[PDB]
Amino acid sequence: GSLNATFYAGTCPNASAMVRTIVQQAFQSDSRIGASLIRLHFHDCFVLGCDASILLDNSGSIISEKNAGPNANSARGFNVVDNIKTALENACPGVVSCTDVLALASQASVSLSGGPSWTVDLGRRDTLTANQAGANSSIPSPTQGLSNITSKFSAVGLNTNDLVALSGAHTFGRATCGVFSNRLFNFSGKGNPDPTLNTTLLSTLQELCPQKGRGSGSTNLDLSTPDAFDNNYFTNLQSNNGLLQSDQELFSTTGSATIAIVTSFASNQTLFFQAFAQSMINMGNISPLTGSSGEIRLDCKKTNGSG
Ligand SMILES: *[C@@H]1O[C@H](CO)[C@@H](O[C@@H]2O[C@H](CO)[C@@H](O[C@@H]3O[C@H](CO)[C@@H](O)[C@H](O[C@H]4O[C@H](CO)[C@@H](O)[C@H](O)[C@@H]4O)[C@@H]3O[C@@H]3OC[C@@H](O)[C@H](O)[C@H]3O)[C@H](O)[C@H]2NC(C)=O)[C@H](O[C@@H]2O[C@@H](C)[C@@H](O)[C@@H](O)[C@@H]2O)[C@H]1NC(C)=O
Ligand SMILES: *[C@@H]1O[C@H](CO)[C@@H](O[C@H]2O[C@H](CO)[C@@H](O[C@@H]3O[C@H](CO)[C@@H](O)[C@H](O[C@@H]4O[C@H](CO)[C@@H](O)[C@H](O)[C@@H]4O)[C@@H]3O[C@@H]3OC[C@@H](O)[C@H](O)[C@H]3O)[C@H](O)[C@H]2NC(C)=O)[C@H](O[C@H]2O[C@@H](C)[C@@H](O)[C@@H](O)[C@@H]2O)[C@H]1NC(C)=O
Ligand SMILES: *[C@@H]1O[C@H](CO)[C@@H](O[C@@H]2O[C@H](CO)[C@@H](OC3O[C@H](CO)[C@@H](O)[C@H](O)[C@@H]3O)[C@H](O)[C@H]2NC(C)=O)[C@H](O[C@@H]2O[C@@H](C)[C@@H](O)[C@@H](O)[C@@H]2O)[C@H]1NC(C)=O
Ligand SMILES: *[C@@H]1O[C@H](CO)[C@@H](O[C@@H]2O[C@H](CO)[C@@H](O[C@H]3O[C@H](CO)[C@@H](O)[C@H](O)[C@@H]3O)[C@H](O)[C@H]2NC(C)=O)[C@H](O[C@@H]2O[C@@H](C)[C@@H](O)[C@@H](O)[C@@H]2O)[C@H]1NC(C)=O
Ligand SMILES: *[C@@H]1O[C@H](CO)[C@@H](O[C@@H]2O[C@H](CO)[C@@H](O[C@H]3O[C@H](CO)[C@@H](O)[C@H](O)[C@@H]3O)[C@H](O)[C@H]2NC(C)=O)[C@H](O[C@H]2O[C@@H](C)[C@@H](O)[C@@H](O)[C@@H]2O)[C@H]1NC(C)=O
Ligand code: HEM
Ligand SMILES: *[C@@H]1O[C@H](CO)[C@@H](O[C@@H]2O[C@H](CO)[C@@H](O)[C@H](O)[C@H]2NC(C)=O)[C@H](O)[C@H]1NC(C)=O
Ligand SMILES: [Ca+2]
Ligand SMILES: [Ca+2]
């Protein structure tokens, strides 16, 4: 419905700088926050479009996406999002959508982490509903395999190029034992660890995530540069060092078109950065609410009139 770069030009011209300022503050105490923030945009877009559905808390009317499988005890940064919103509301009351906040924060997070900048498209509007069931089914799982994951991307209009570049977001941030422990001991019922997992990594992960353990351990998505936004994620894959089954599958899946793309990104960081920016824009374009559909939420946690 034609999101555009200049949507707030009249009404909140400095929105981008303001978001960036808050995200930078946030980074001061939490190295992980930029990663968590971009993930929220991803999880937002993949369920009923980039409509801030994910942000909504439980109520009598709302069964929160926060409780969905991919989100529960995993998704994070909601308080920081509130802090960004509070700044915007103070400068430009009633203007900037939560859906837009997520898009803007994503760019700030990458740029602040040494990554590329891109021109965020704006004009999204905030949903009055959540779709927990959609979150359970629409969002890719790390263990469902590349074909299913690729279908899930297609399903929202994102192609293989998009999939590989976007997977590059795993260049920063963290993962809990449970999302990758299937690799560790009895992979795919084989009785052995995933052979595509670098044995050096395997050994440390095994210690981190003991087989009859509680699963509290957490580690870096990118063992090379856990916080910098760079192409090391791709180089890692070349060395069997991708963390998630879904990560490594991009390189190790015999005959996958993904392999050449990863190699290309591994060779040329600039190329990866350019592709990542375009892909972020593409993801950001998924099924927006626009015009007078939806609302501008005053508090991202709640529909207007609920708090
Ligand atoms: C990026 O996306 C933005 C959102 O779509 C664009 O801005 C919107 O642009 C429209 C105009 O096309 C703005 O609409 C108006 O809103 C005011 C009230 O707030 C109305 O009074 C006004 O209506 C009168 O003018 C009409 C002519 O346009 C008459 O036909 C009408 O009878 C009235 O006399 C008008 O309301 C629009 O009228 C036409 C309808 O088709 C339309 O449904 C109705 O909304 C709108 O306010 C604005 N939204 C925001 C948040 O700014 C944006 O467009 C550019 O920037 C704006 C500010 C305008 O200057 C546009 O002319 C300009 O193209 C766009 N930017 C780019 C580069 O694409
Ligand atoms: C790594 O993961 C693998 C997957 O879990 C696992 O593999 C095997 O898993 C199970 C073993 O528990 C195998 O299933 C069994 O198959 C035989 C014969 O086909 C059945 O006789 C078994 O029945 C059992 O027998 C009684 C009846 O007499 C059952 O009532 C009872 O449930 C009992 O479990 C059993 O059958 C299953 O029974 C329950 C049904 O709901 C299932 O549909 C049915 O399959 C399975 O054949 C085998 N799969 C594969 C791909 O190999 C690995 O376990 C191995 O180590 C041991 C635990 C031992 O089970 C070995 O046989 C396995 O090879 C596991 N490997 C490691 C090291 O952890
Ligand atoms: C979407 O996925 C989430 C996460 O799996 C569903 O929520 C979870 O559902 C389970 C079981 O229905 C709850 O669990 C218990 O865990 C045991 C299962 O191994 C049960 O035997 C035992 O009864 C426990 O009470 C989880 O607590 C729950 N997890 C979270 C974070 O909320 C979710 O399911 C929805 O919510 C449930 C509470 C049920 O009401 C479901 O009917 C309901 O569908 C999934 N949501 C949708 C729309 O599919
Ligand atoms: C590493 O990746 C970067 C980015 O993808 C490559 O540089 C880009 O190369 C493209 C060409 O494929 C180049 O393309 C456009 O811009 C032109 C106008 O400026 C336009 O006329 C043209 O139609 C294209 O749309 C693009 O500008 C450029 N991006 C940047 C930021 O420089 C890079 O390419 C190598 O260097 C470029 C300049 C070109 O000479 C290529 O032929 C080279 O391959 C990649 N390096 C390597 C070794 O592959
Ligand atoms: C298991 O993980 C190991 C550690 O990451 C990995 O070894 C390392 O592989 C890299 C890549 O070749 C080596 O790096 C040099 O060269 C490139 C130049 O482009 C640089 O980017 C690097 O920074 C570095 O200069 C690195 O030295 C190497 N470390 C050790 C101790 O060997 C293992 O890779 C082995 O298998 C291949 C990937 C191949 O590269 C081997 O040479 C390498 O030893 C990795 N094991 C497996 C099976 O993937
Ligand atoms: C391609 C399919 C994808 C799968 C299977 C996947 C799965 C996962 C999993 C399992 C985690 C760890 C969750 C946890 O341990 O709590 C995670 C974290 C993360 N995801 Fe992905 N994801 C995918 C795509 C994406 C995309 C498209 C983006 C952004 C553009 C993204 C950004 C992130 C970030 C930054 C983290 C770390 C978050 C943090 O530290 O808070 N992922 N993802
Ligand atoms: C646009 O936004 C930026 C950031 O919020 C504004 O600049 C900051 O202004 C404060 C207040 O004096 C300073 O403490 C910061 O050091 C500044 N940060 C940066 C990155 O510049 C800026 O003034 C805003 N411009 C307008 C017209 O409102
Ligand atoms: Ca959504
Ligand atoms: Ca990195």
Six-digit token string for 9: 């030009």
Beta partners for residue 295, in sequence order: 126
Helix (H, G, I), strand (E, B) or coil at 16: helix
Kindly state the DSSP code that residue 173 receives in the 8-state scheme.
-
DSSP codes, 175-243: EEHHHHGGGTSSGGGSSS--TTS-HHHHHHHHHHS-TTS----EEES-SS-SSS-STHHHHHHHTT--S
- Beta carbons of 107 and 270 less than 8 angstroms apart: no
Angle at 237 between CA 235 and CA 239, to 5 degrees: 80
Q: Resolution of this PDB entry, in A? A: 2.0
Number of neighbouring beta carbons within 10 Å of residue 278: 14
Q: Distance between CA atoms of 276 and 278, rounded to whole angstroms?
A: 5
What is the rounded distance in angstroms from the CA atom of residue 117 to the CA atom of residue 119?
A: 7
* Cα–Cα distance measured from residue 32 to residue 34, given in angstroms and rounded to the nearest whole number: 6
56: left (phi over 0), alpha (psi -120 to 50) or beta: beta
CA distance readout (Å), 203 to 163, 181, 197: 29, 12, 10
Pocket of ligand 6 (CB under 6 A): 32, 35-36, 38-39, 42, 74, 76, 140-142, 149, 163, 166-167, 169-170, 172-176, 179, 221, 244, 246
Q: How far is CA 139 from CA 20, 125, 145, 154, in A?
A: 27, 21, 13, 12
Give the separation between CA 32 and CA 178, rounded to whole angstroms.
19
Catalytic one of 20, 41, 43, 183: 43
Task: Return the residue matching tokens 């791709």.
Answer: 234
Which residue from 41, 42, 150 has its CB within 8 A of the most atoms of ligand 6, so it is best to mutate? Answer: 42
Supply 279's token pair: 């892909």
Token pair 């946030």 is found at 26
Single out the residue of 99, 158, 154 nearest to residue 280, CA to CA: 158
Q: Which bin fits 127, alpha (ψ -120 to 50), beta or left (φ > 0)?
A: beta
Q: How was this structure determined?
A: X-ray
Backbone φ and ψ of 229, nearest 5°: -90, 105
Residue type, 208: L
**Distances in Å between the alpha carbon of 153 and those of 54, 177, 283, 292?**
18, 25, 9, 28
Amino acid at the residue 214: R
Per DSSP, 67 falls in state G
| Helix axis angle, 258-267 to 245-252, nearest 10° | 100
Give all domains of the chain, ordered by start, each with its CATH number: 3-139+284-304 (1.10.520.10), 140-283 (1.10.420.10)
CA distances from 179 to 192, 216, 244, 294 (A): 17, 11, 7, 34
How far apart are the two ends of the chain, measured CA to CA in Å? 29
Q: What one-character DSSP code corresponds to residue 254?
A: T
The Cα 201–Cα 209 span in angstroms is 12
267 burial via Cβ count (<10 Å: 0-12, 13-18, 19+) = middle
What tokens does 193 get?
A: 């660890």
- Alpha-carbon Rg of the chain, whole angstroms? 19
- Among protein residues, the one with the nearest Cα to ligand 2's atom 49 is 189
Angle, CA 108 vertex, CA 224 and CA 112 arms, to 5°: 45
Told to judge if 43 belongs to the known catalytic residues of this protein, a careful annotator would answer yes
Cβ partners under 8 Å of residue 17, min gap 6: none
- The angle at the Cα of 117, spanning 121 to 115, to the nearest 5 degrees, equals 140
Beta bridge partners of 289: 125
- Residue 269 CA, distance from chain mean position: 20
- Number of C-beta neighbours around residue 155 at 10 A: 11
CA 186/CA 183 separation, integer angstroms: 7
Strand intervals (E) in the chain: 174-176, 218-220
Give φ, ψ of 175 to 5 degrees.
Answer: -140, 140
Question: Distance between CA 106 and CA 39 in Å, rounded?
Answer: 8
- The count of C-alpha atoms lying within 13 angstroms of the C-alpha of 168, restricted to the half-sphere facing its C-beta, is 36
DSSP 3-state percent helix, strand, coil across the chain (nearest 5): 50, 5, 45
Collapsing DSSP to helix, strand or coil, 125 comes out as: strand
Residues with CB under 6 A from ligand 4: 268, 270-271, 274
Structure tokens that stand for 62 in this block: 């709302």
- Give the distance from CA 88 to its chain's centroid: 22
> Looking at the DSSP assignment, which residues form a beta bridge with residue 218?
176
16: Cβ–Cβ under 8 A, 6 or more apart, which residues?
A: 104, 107, 108, 120
